[model samples]
Target chain A: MFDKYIVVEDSLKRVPGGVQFGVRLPYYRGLGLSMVETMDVTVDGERVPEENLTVTLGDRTVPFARRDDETDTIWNFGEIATVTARLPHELGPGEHQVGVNFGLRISYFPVPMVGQDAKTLKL
Target chain B: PQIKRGVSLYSFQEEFFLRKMTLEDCVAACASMGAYGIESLAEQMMPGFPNLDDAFYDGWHAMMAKYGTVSVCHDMFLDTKKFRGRLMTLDEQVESFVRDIRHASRLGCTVIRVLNFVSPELMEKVLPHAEQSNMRLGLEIHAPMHFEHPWVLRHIEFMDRLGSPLLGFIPDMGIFTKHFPPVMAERLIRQGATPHIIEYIREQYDRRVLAEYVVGDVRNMGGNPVDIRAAEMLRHNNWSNPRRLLEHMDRIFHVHAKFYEMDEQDRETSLGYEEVIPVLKEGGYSGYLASEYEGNRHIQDAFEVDSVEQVRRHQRMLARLI
Candidate 1:
């Protein structure tokens, strides 16, 4: 279920420093941003460091490390968030492997529900 | 008065989320099952929710009319921590809840399933709006918090104090689970949990070992992380007694027939519908027993969840029992 919508199609684009793509929550209900415990992204099997990434839901963009502090922002069901990765170099136009492993701290569950998905898409 | 069968559209979450099914499609699926009573989570199913337009409302009614379904309940959430740094003030919570009451009413829902943990103070503030809107607020008594839980007791007290028919309970059948769903164990195994660990937990559960003790034993045995989490979740299942339904029969405005899996016999694998339906019948509950198929989310990773089939099986089981 979590894997189905992890990486949005045709959303990958190269930014000035690195690459950015869209990701969505796998939960059935909308949750506060603070409930998003972790969101890790990777390109071609290489992990993107937390500091090098930021997530923007709607108009607000914040460093991934501070996502826990964003209690006001709600990641609604069916909504997608953009994950921008600041990399040292951009990849050539071709197919690239993208992976995302994210977790949500749902209030009702004892453990954080994690979702992981990897997709090969044209950059 | 008699027990009625229905399908909570939440059972179709995966299909709806994947765009495999639309809101109308979900309603039609319920109608296809001969379960005419519909329940929905406005935030999840409705487009531009919380503030819907007249066009959306008209379409909702038209779809219901086309499918021969009636809106039984609208599930609402109280996002108290919706903002950063602070929880929503009580006044804001009341405002949000009141808005949901009106929204549910506009959608032709007679009852609103209020999420657990909504404060009595907040409910008091919203009660007048519910009364004005002619909507009943059913505070969902979900698992991990059973009939005797302080919160449940408080709500019962609040109900008695008010003596209003509009305030009541909506018991999710999850509280009556008799077994840890085997499908969940299968999914956990796929997620890295060992078969031995799951077997041991099931054994301990059948032997009536305390959940914390079972978790501790699993930890000492160096159980898989996922399996340990499974053990933790075990505590939530089978927390409430089915007979408890007798004590608060009158207050039960609706029922969430929560199920994880159903076998070929049309019997639920986790919840005790065989035991629960009779109690509802004995209590003379005429409300909708909305099939709430939660197993889809658990099994979605390993296989494509057949929510429509699952609900059909659930409705069949409910039909047999009710």
Candidate 2:
């Protein structure tokens, strides 16, 4: 499958193998846009270190994948972190479903009524 | 005849919120879990949101129809924009919510939630419009803002002043657990966490580091946050003294079974659901207790598990107690 790169992770709050349920965002004064980062890939609750993890968007690989940047405290859109993928031809020129199946076993918070993962469309 | 459970759609708003679920899948999962109703944020009823359209509502209704699910209710708080921050004028604010009520009534919904604001004059002006439609106007007396908070008390005063029962309370879960900090801190310490550690956490932990760690992991999705407006919590807002009057009214309708943390241990050893469910059943509440799954320490699966489990426990509590 010549799959395009997609970023299944947008709001990152923790890095891999650091600790489960470790990342916690501070509430700013206004507009609760608390930011979080992504931990690198791990299967069955084990961190997969030293590998390039990319989400398949279509045919192109948009690299917002996790990295081993110890110096950067903020993802900051800092280091060409993620490539923005606009509309694709096969997607019929509008916002088509960027499909992926992701399940991570880690310590995270529970939102008011959302679940942990989705199959497609990142709903 | 009531064979349906519940799965709330409020958790699916944020990208990192209880990951793995889409808006549509959240709906479908609730159905699979035997949820009889789905109460979504007012925005999610349509596509390209915060603005609803017929297509989305129709599709949502179709999905609900297929699964034997009806929408439980929908709500919006004043914080969606700082109207209290004085961004919009009174007429603009009145017109804005007037449209919201119209949308709810058009969709055939009987209940809608909004913070108790907009002028008293404006409130009365809008009441006649909704009276014809018969939507239950709920002013979610979320903690801190209970019968006593200036806002809620002001509202009750507004109600007494108007002498109409149209305005009533839909107590959110803050009354159950930590919806706010300093209050929660005292409670958590009582619940068995360390008072020493909990009190000095800010001095003990770095915030940017915390937020950064959270960004990557997103694990503690609904647990408490470090930076909180300690004074603004719902714990202190109950100037209305619930024990006296909340029991006397038939006006109480829908409620939010908001969750933050649970000690299954508390249930296993202590009174458990035995103690909790009686709070409502004794109140004779027959409406849906729409769960809000928020807990920093709660793992993703635990969120759903806890909600359904709590509901089941609630059912048992109702059967056994009241």
Candidate 3:
């Protein structure tokens, strides 16, 4: 799961949510957001709320067992998804920064782990 | 009694997506392979992917016309997300599904290969739409999904219960294998896995002892990280009997004649084509046997071969068998 992380360093194009950055899942095993307690997403130093940040695989959001449960079917590994979020409000094409902080439960861990990744995206 | 020969453009995905070959080039390759039927991955073939724009599909038949091949089937992904901020609602997903079904029909594809990832619940929801579209929908019976797995069996049972002739399966040939391909073995060795560990890994799989395959077990045995990572995927590459093809013959609409590597004789090195093809032909499957070569991603040993040539070789091999 460590091998698979998301960053938006390459390109940004207009999408339904806002400008979208390509999310790559590099592992063969899938990661389910059900194991994640909360996700903190940001754009250009502006933190977006849970309501504005969404992870979508293909044409739908990652399949979940329950909205906030841990037993959901995982977003399969080897998938290319669009992590859509509201940038610190509407931003013009040029250069921007995208970041995501995740609070996840690795197996057999009593406490949650917080991980974050940031990238300079070309819009 | 005639087996329809075809080539999946996916056979040349690396080239096509890398822009080394255009769709026209892939179609031409199919024609050169002497295949009259062509199966296309919708996302890969289309201009905007998931959006069937007029410019892309306007000449679908014309391109096939130019190549003298028929659009046999279109592969569709039951996408999980369409919008960036949220997953598409069930209704939204159905709308996308129906849209592809209609697009496949308009593109002159008679059948659509539905990936196995389309959950049973989603497929069940799409059954009525299957009848709505002019094209047929076939669930791809992909690898690691054994005939006995509840996922496969439940779908089989659902098909029977749904009683919709529009719903069926497209069997991928990768499921008939007993072990990893030799090229993969060599690739692992090249990546620094010891021969003893590789041999032991294969033995464990053949012996059905995976409890000892955990990270602790391997690290305790001096296994490197590369070896552990390589062995991790083997559990999901499990095989099923080729005869499973026959069991679902009544429900098969297309065949993903998936191949990894082929020799000069056009025989697959890993998949049991010699054994499986005979059974499929004996079982009287007249659907399109589309040559789908996937070795481009893994075959570092021979990375320079033109995929067109590989697929042509595969088609010739299928021709001899069928």
Candidate 4:
């Protein structure tokens, strides 16, 4: 698995509840999200419910669903690939950690590997 | 005329993201090596490109002033999906180019580098806007795209018909390479490819055999099929005629001097600089030869490792050749 995705600093935006951070595939091409068999995300040592997460690729948002029945596959973006989630409670003014793990498989490949990214944010 | 040496910020992408270098640091790196021009990917450098705030433009000019570097060209792209559920219209591409032309103008760049996806008709639509801004649009000849390709000739013919000095070509040096880098074979070997498969792969590369054959026959050779396929594909796509490209020197603007590996003698291992550089010198083409180090950054820091030394070496070679 290629570790290409990184949290872009300028993409970090504070919203109503939790913060919305942007992740970008700095590499050349966009990877299909359908390849992702599963995704695990953690915020500030707390495991966020997968149902709370949402990823916006183009103009629409889709719930963080894996490859099983999800058809929204493309994660193409102009600048940054964004993932938004409203945390359990409002994040107070301070520092926090965000972690993401995606188990992905290419079209013809049988094996699925994990790509992990972690970022520290200060609001 | 002698070709001017420059630096492409795309070369320092790894370093910048690693927090090892800033935009200004990249400029200083270019200046420190005596690179006369800079080819910047505006989207990469600006916080909000195309809609860049005044402060970003202010910082851009300040960097140029401090470093004594000239902005030779700014890179732009025509995203097919700028609008939802439909391909970008020709008018929309023109609008995007207009934005980029205006943006490139503010940064003191007279040329904007475009990709192959921008069609001839779309370019014609934007040519008037480009003329208004006095910015040249140079379509890049990237790898897998030889000058002999029909698409290339069509664009050249289109430029000839338009008679616009502002529409030209930016030939990336990768097209002149003769073979694959030895590092590619080594990388694949480490990935569990056997000697037999490596030999077969090299044979297919030399012959430029169909990819289907290699993928099917080489699967039993203890290598990940995709890596072997990529190795063969990389070497096969680089059979372009450098001298042929120089025939249209009037339409040539900037260059992406893409390189991978160099030896102790300060020469790139794969690209045929001996033939390519002489053609440019004999043609007396004076333009920025942007040193774009697109070496393998997947396994290691090809650009970050000895980037200054590699660029300095290339510049010295260009100086000697010119």
Candidate 5:
């Protein structure tokens, strides 16, 4: 269920340093940013370093290290969060394999649930 | 005569999430199927929730009026661990709970569905506010929690002592599941569970083997992590006898009418609705049986989840039984 909606089409765009894409919450309801345990993104089998990734929900953008403290911000269901990654360089326009892995700590569950998906799309 | 039909907007989350339908579209679909009692999770359906403006409220009522549907139940969550380290303080929980009550009440919903994780202490604190708003707080009795669970009994005792009409239970039909949903098995397979493990689990479940024993057998069989998790998921399916509902009829504020797959015969394949519906009628349950189609999420990877047709078939079966 969570794997199907991880990466949507037309979410990829070239940024100044690297690339930014959109990711939707896998769970049915909205969750606080604190519940997010992990967010790992990969482009064409090349993993994006943890330090290069920052997620933006609404207007607040937090680095991966500080996401656990973002209790005030909610990643609402059906809404997408922009993932901005500082890559080596922006690639030329073509098809690329984009993958995302998320570990969400739903309050009701004892342990965090993981959602991962990879999609090939035109840049 | 008191039992009525409804559809929880939760069933259409797939369509809504995919931008294939709007909230108004979901209401109109329910009305088309003759299920006028509408239920929804405010956080999932409503925009600018927890602080919905007067304009949104007015537009919401207008849309409901246009579709000729009534708000039946509003689902809420506590999110006690909204923060990273610690749980929300007792006072924080109370404030949030009260906020949900007011929100649901403003939307013309008489009942608010809360999870069983809520403690009786919290319910006691919020009971007065619920009564003041004329909204009943229904603790959902979902899977892994049965009618006779100690926690459920404790809540019943609390309600009995207070004698408050604003406190009750919303029994989810998942407790009455007599068979493991085949769709769930398919999902497990898609998630990497071996067919042999699924067959073993199903056989053991049919034989009335205890969950712990099933897990032990799988572990002894050298089952991988995925296989072990499959066994754990199967453990949640409980076949609580429908007749047991007779003892707590008055406490049941609403029915979740939870379903997965409705066959070509218009019968729910996993749950025993034919048996449970009669029991509810006999107990004089004058509440909404809101169709909650969870199967859509399980099968979305394989194909498009046709929630509309699934809900239509469920409502048809419910109409026949009622």
Candidate 6:
């Protein structure tokens, strides 16, 4: 798992929320891992539904609650947004490698016009 | 993209040096010769500039606008008379530096190239003014003492210690060549100046003959014979190690690709830039390279008419390799 991520600034802007950090989930190319910036985070993945868990890119981890709603759990910032994930091993392990994988449903501009084939990495 | 080219108005001095033209003539001369831009000193831009006259100011804007010629950069070399370090406590220098930055910005020029010209204390003072204006400040990197220059490390250390993205370099290739041939003694003798001032100027270079030229005429139009000669000499000498220069590429924002003499073989017997480009590429430089011409050799074939042509030829040579 890479600690730092690259920010692609093609037609990049400085919005009120902050810079839109484009982090795509390389692990699951065509899947969704809903994440947001607020204190409340909702995650909806192909495998499971993770709700109210904080989505962050920092070094700290704080688990809120995973509220369940029959409707949806994905969080999307229509234009400018950041995507983040809580890595499995804050400590206690070598890395969350091949078998154990993760993804991020990133926010992007010019929606539906995504570029580049994503890839995976070892922790 | 179409290749854009321009020359510094200082090239006008070439005509005056050869007794061929006046300052007024060099204006249309540079423009008609296809120099799309002109870099001028604040003082030289007006008949008596930096004295701050409104007529010169209004006339300058109207004239340049009329010609479609823009002032890409402004030169602000600090002397204790005006600037002290980079601060306003030394009020006039601060005003000079700040005024130019604002003027250049209003003129649609994005970069303000200046030399701390003083010591580090001045550089330290100028940082805040630079940041506040949203202007990018560049430290002039003159050769013979450029690249990985002491200030490069000092500023790097300062930036690392304080860590601001605002500090960077305006690299001058002249620092690479800091020696010049002492040909002015005979030239001055022909003009009949006292040798004392010339010797006084040369003693700084530790070259005795130049100081000897200035020894007699206190009123000779020729100034400090030695320092003036040494300054010219410093412009021609090939003293830079480009491979070492590569280490600071990311640090350089704009460039003053200084040139002095080009030989019959089209070789810069002075500083060879053909050998310089590959090394710069190694450091990942994809930036502006400004061609600056200064030399003692003949820039003409017949009269000063061909001198501008020579500068164009030199630009072609640089573009070929760059």
Please list the residue runs of candidate 1 whose C-alpha ends up more than 4 Å from where it truly belongs after superposition. A1-4, A9-11, A15-18, A31-38, A45-76, A80-88, A103-114
Give the C-alpha miss distance for residue B293 in model 6, angstroms.
1.9
Docking class of 3: incorrect
Better of 2 and 5 by TM-score: 5
Candidate 1: Cα lDDT at B109: 95
What's the lDDT for all of these models? 0.83, 0.43, 0.70, 0.70, 0.86, 0.46
- TM-score (C-alpha, index-matched) for candidate 3: 0.71
Q: By DockQ thresholds, what CAPRI class is model 6?
A: incorrect
**Order of models, best lDDT first:** 5, 1, 4, 3, 6, 2
B194: Cα error in model 6, Å: 21
- Per lDDT, the best of the predicted structures is 5
TM-score of chain A of each: 0.92, 0.22, 0.74, 0.77, 0.91, 0.24
User: Residue pairs in steric clash, candidate 5?
Assistant: none
Runs in model 5 deviating more than 4 A are A49-51
Candidate 4: stretches off by over 4 Å: A1-24, A28-51, A54-123, B207-223, B301-306
- The candidate, 3 or 4, that scores higher on DockQ is 4
In candidate 4, how many Å is residue B233 off?
A: 2.4
B1-322 per-residue lDDT for model 6 (tens digits): 1224456655444444333655445556655645556665443333333345656567667767666666655655443321112232555556556766666555445456666354454555666787776666677766445555575676667655645565667777755543332334434434453566545444544442333343333325455553354435433343567676666666666667666555455555445476666666667775555556655233321223345555666666665665
lDDT of 3 by residue, B1-322 (tens): 7789998887876566435788888898788878978988765556444455677776777898898999999988654532323566888778778877888877888888887766677678887877766567888877767566788888888778888888888888777765577667777877789888888777766665663454456667888987886676575565678776777788889988888788897778777788888888888888898888877656634456478878888888888887
**TM-score of every prediction relative to native:** 0.90, 0.54, 0.71, 0.76, 0.95, 0.50
| Residue range B140-171, candidate 1, lDDT tens digits | 99977778889999888877888888888999
lDDT of 5 by residue, B244-266 (tens): 89988887888999999888999
lDDT-superior candidate, 2 or 5: 5
lDDT of candidate 4?
0.70
Better of 3 and 4 by TM-score: 4
Question: Interface RMSD of the predictions, in order shown?
Answer: 3.2, 15.1, 10.7, 8.6, 1.5, 30.3
Kindly list the per-residue Cα lDDT of model 2 for residues A1-123, writing each as its tens digit. Answer: 001111233332223322111111111101111112332333232333323443222233333333222211222111123323222111222222323222211111122211122212211
- What does candidate 4 score on TM? 0.76
Compared with the true structure, what per-residue lDDT tens digits does model 4 show for residues B1-322?
6788888877776565555688899899999878869988765665456667888888888989999999998888555443333555777767867888999999999779988767899888899888888999999887677677789989988878899898988988877866655656665666566766786776775676656776666765555764555555644456578778667788789888877666667777778788888888877788888888766353351223655666777777766666
What is the C-alpha lDDT profile of model 4 across A74-110, one tens digit per residue? 4432245567878878877777777777655532222
